[model samples]
Target: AVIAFGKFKLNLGTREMFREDEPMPLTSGEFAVLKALVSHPREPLSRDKLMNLARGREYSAMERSIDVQISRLRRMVEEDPAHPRYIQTVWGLGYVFVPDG
Candidate 1:
């Protein structure tokens, strides 16, 4: 499915995101995390929830990896990596997806 919001377009089935028709490369974990956020744009999921969703399988082996993926995803999707918009951090909480949709 094609998910278009703001300047970003994510093809979930193909596992890719684009900005203004330009493709952006994302790691597997980054793709997984982005998909989860897209699926729930109005709610803020907790850290554990993010980690689990990012894993795509189970949340048993790669918590830190999720963090890295999220960071990369933010850099790609956010207007400014330092000051994000689409994906806003909740400090101790996980994150919330704020798509232009």
Candidate 2:
């Protein structure tokens, strides 16, 4: 009934994400981006779409912050953040959450 991608698991009842038994450290914004990315699975989402998906319809100017959130999330799940597996970049399209990775 919930989501699990690779080493990560999203807990709906606790509103928490975990890497194995340890709780993954996340800021509100990081979780926001992950929340949106996971919702769409491997589908690519541009920054503008993610901005609204995570933070509602406000803070359009902070679209660049999505990069930071994506980065942080990768650090949590990816063994090598430089070549991320779970949160892979979509180039001009933005980001996609790869469930198999």
Candidate 3:
């Protein structure tokens, strides 16, 4: 399946992300984490949940540094990582992806 949001289009098959016709590099781990969020937009997903979902029997393993990848994703998708709108943190409820934002 392909996921399109804003100018970015996520190709699930080969694990690639594109901004319109421009290709942007996204690692498998980042792609997995992002797929989890975009798959369940507006839903809160904890680090453990993210880990399990990213695995999804598709890969071997991922790093334990969720916050690191999150920041990286924010930097990639958000206009401002300090004030991220695409991916926001929920108080005591993990993180939520705002597709409309």
Candidate 4:
């Protein structure tokens, strides 16, 4: 399934993310994170849950590293990384993807 969020599209089968029809340059981890976020829009996903969702299982390297991946994604997709619009921090929880205003 291809999930659409604003100008972005997440293709589950292809494992690809596109911005306005153009493919975005995303590392495997970044893509995985995006997939997990978009798949569960508006829902807060904790770091451990995100890791498990993105990687199919938890990896030691993914511990606390979700923040880094989220920052990279904000730079790639958000108009303002400092004040994100789509990816939002839930404060003490983790993050949520809000596709609309």
Best by TM-score: 1
Q: Using lDDT as the measure, which candidate wins?
A: 4
User: Where is the poorest 10-residue window by lDDT in model 4?
Assistant: 55-64
Compute the lDDT of residue 10 as modeled in candidate 4: 80
Writing each residue's lDDT as its tens digit, candidate 4 over 41-84 gives: 89999997887887874575565588789989999999999999
Model 2, 1-101: lDDT tens digits are 36998888986545688888689877888877887888898999999888788878466546668878988898898999999978888889879988973
lDDT tens digits by residue: candidate 3, 1-101: 89899989988787878988689988788988999999998999998888788876633334436777898999898888999998899989888888873
User: Candidate 3: which stretches are off by over 4 Å?
Assistant: 56-101
TM-score of each: 0.54, 0.52, 0.52, 0.52
lDDT of residue 52 for candidate 2: 85
Q: Candidate 4: misplaced stretches above 4 Å?
A: 57-101
- Candidate 2 has a TM-score of 0.52
- TM-score of candidate 1 against the unseen true structure: 0.54
Best-to-worst lDDT order: 4, 3, 1, 2
- lDDT, candidate 1, at 44: 90
Question: Which scores greater on TM-score, model 1 or model 4?
Answer: 1
